[PDB]
Amino acid sequence: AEIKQGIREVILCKDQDGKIGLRLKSIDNGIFVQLVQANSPASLVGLRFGDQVLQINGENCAGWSSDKAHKVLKQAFGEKITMTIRDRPFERTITMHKDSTGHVGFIFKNGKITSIVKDSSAARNGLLTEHNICEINGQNVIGLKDSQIADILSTSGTVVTITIMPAFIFEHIIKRMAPSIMKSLMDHTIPEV
Template sequence: MSLYPSLEDMKVDQLYKAQSGQTNNHASPAFPQIPSETASDVALYPALNEFMGLELPSEWSGQSNAVAVAPSYALSGFSGQTSSNLIAPISGQSLGLQRAQVTHGIREVTICKGANGKVGLRVKAISNGVFVCLVEKGSPAAIVGLRFGDQILSINGENVAGYSMDQVHSMFRKAEVNGIKVIVRDRPFERTVTLHKDSVGKIGFQFKEGRIIGLVQDSSAARNGLLTDHHLLEVDGQNVVAVPDKQITSIIDAAGPVVTVTVCPSFIYDHMIKKMASSLLKNSMDHSVPSI
């Protein structure tokens, strides 16, 4: 005998209580009438319009597996809107979101050295991990899609956990010209926040030298969980590390009504670029718009 009731038993129990008046004033709305189904037809999760009592747009109703496939969304900062207008589905529609996607997943890339005998990246050791802190524009590292903040796990089958920056740079220098196999975790310290511009084209935060220093009350930035003391790394997937504030503002202004920013805590960013010349980051970093 199971210690816990099944999802279907809980639905039936709530439906019975709702029909017999056994609900209190604070109970969630009753589940709708449950049609007869075979065991194989029962969805793993309730439909979106039933999930935790949320009132979601009608065009989402009838979709199953709410927990597994619920679309990404962002809250706009427009005043005077009803709650139903605050949810704006953007999955698969925002090109910037697709370019900026952070998966935290593991992948393998194969790098070949360039004409100068280099792969075109620098790393930094943090908490016994090795992280990419510079990807040179036009370099082999840029071509295979390495990005600021990627964690290097192994090089040619050798685990680099606990290695120093110099050890990893030495491994790349000593590697063969072709076929350098690198296992990478996608930017574990970073996250993305998708924002909506208001009626005057603002998304609701202030920054100085790339560091977020303030949020506008009730703005899209505040509603969607952007935090101060975080550093802007990308705008719609385009790297903006060491890019002047005015240029970052221009990139945001030129973006569409939906903007995705990639950020990491400022203390981590400061550690990653420590002892690196700002001119190196500004002039050598790959700031191109990524392809998808």
């Protein structure tokens, strides 16, 4: 859940169907992860929604279109693809503690935080409104129903870490992607060890 500084290298191999499980999006002359498929090479190496791809196979992604990034992946030798990644650079993680009645202290609608409750852990920790909830305790919740998000908060331990993104950036990233895809095909698992 907590956002790593700097840059890391990941190494992927296409699956038996020639797939890595990734959709990419051009944002502000970089390339970002828009969708990670469950049970994919991308999910398994730990790519996340909102990760920035700096290089593919040692080539800079700066100023690439979304189409170009997809084409480069499609045309890469499948046995080893290297990517250089910056971790979720548009997001931040906020750690809160549930009160005696199980609340962290906010209202949300359609996955977006809309108000902060007075004298709550959310207030104390400076949770912001107009921010989309991306992850809870390192689990992606994008495309899940509000009731499902509430359930995940319920089943957390008392320490709840939420990864948020300014709504305007979130809405930019998810543009040209069908809601059914986010719900059905975005990875929502806890990572394996």
